[PDB]
Amino acid sequence: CYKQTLSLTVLTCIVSLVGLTGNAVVLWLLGCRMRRNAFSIYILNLAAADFLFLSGRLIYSLLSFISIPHTISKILYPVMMFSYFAGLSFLSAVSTERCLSVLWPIWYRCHRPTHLSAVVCVLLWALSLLRSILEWMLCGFLFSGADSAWCQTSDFITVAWLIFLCVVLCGSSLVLLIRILCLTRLYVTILLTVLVFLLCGLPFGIQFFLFLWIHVDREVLFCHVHLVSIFLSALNSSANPIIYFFV
């Protein structure tokens, strides 16, 4: 696996770098506008969550071409995963309001409270923080000698949380097309956003927390599923500013 490990860790440095420079500009541009409508507030929040995640992908990638201490990997973990889950929930929140803007357009522009997006975003930052505390309490230092079934229950919820976000994204996108049908850029943008999330956002997070209790293989699981998921996740974070803001 020594051939692939270097190939994918270097390629992640490149993607992480271009992603970070694409998220700094989004945070800068959207942090300066005075209006900053409902859509921009989720994009601003998702650029923040993608900045932390790509920074963690970039630190670990650099200290991997070198052999640095392992103390970072234990302290950069509950930041990378906290930011990763914050991003997947902000993709699902964009799709949902994109559907509500089409199902009820007058309500969206005339009766939707002016601070819904800000309040929803601080809920989704908090729901991620709660999920990370729960994973630390039940799988970590505190409940260490108790048993391993308390860690496995926590990993169960993370998979449940990941699927529920997928149904929100796909369900919200599907109702949009059913309503529109009952017009090219719309179909291009909906399927691009659903595919980039499905094929580059979810694989990591599902392979990590599922295969954490199903013994699969030393070689297949790591060198062919794990590193590819890591690369694909960095790719998904490095394209959200392009798919959602620069177009």
Partner: peptide
């Protein structure tokens, strides 16, 4: 307890 099949990245704490 912690399964013996885990790798270095699977012991995250």
């Amino acid at each position: 307890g912690r399964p013996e099949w885990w790798m270095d990245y699977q012991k995250r704490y």
